[PDB]
Amino acid sequence: KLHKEPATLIKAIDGDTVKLMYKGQPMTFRLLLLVDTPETKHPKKGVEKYGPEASAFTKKMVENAKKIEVEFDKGQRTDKYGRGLAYIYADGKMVNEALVRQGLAKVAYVYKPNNTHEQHLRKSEAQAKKEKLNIWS
Ligand SMILES: Cc1cn([C@H]2C[C@H](OP(=O)(O)O)[C@@H](COP(=O)(O)O)O2)c(=O)[nH]c1=O
Ligand SMILES: [Ca+2]
Secondary structure, eight states: OOOEEEEEEEEEEEETTTEEEEEEEEEEETTTTTEOSSSSTTTSSSSSSHHHHHHHHHHHHHOOOOOOOEEOOOOSOTTOOOOOOEEEEEEEEEEHHHHHHTSSEOOOBBBBTTTTHHHHHHHHHHHHHHHHHHHHH
């Protein structure tokens, strides 16, 4: 079973990459199962169509949260770049899914066993497509 753990915001970096104080140590966390478009991609040098709105949305959601919690999946907790891989919740709402529901990020990098909430995010993504939101307009 997965479970939520306390984390302190240190800084939001873009739509899907946030730096958090987790168990007393500063580290970059990357949101599982998403590809926010970037604010500072690498092919793209930077700023994507919808990458800066996905960044603003996560920035406000974590900045204004009363509390942040991280939820690791059941596979590896870290990727090759040493970023923590988690579902992040702000006030009990999953930032991963809110981005996807808004049509501000797409579901991507699905590596089992790290896909417990994959179907939940694919649903939210289907609805953002139906309603034609943002990247899907
Ligand atoms: C979300 C996620 C990304 N990644 C890797 C895939 C991509 O590697 P490559 O850089 O080699 O293409 C990169 C994309 O991350 P970003 O979207 O943050 O740039 O991070 C994982 O390995 N596992 C994951 O769960
Ligand atoms: Ca990104």
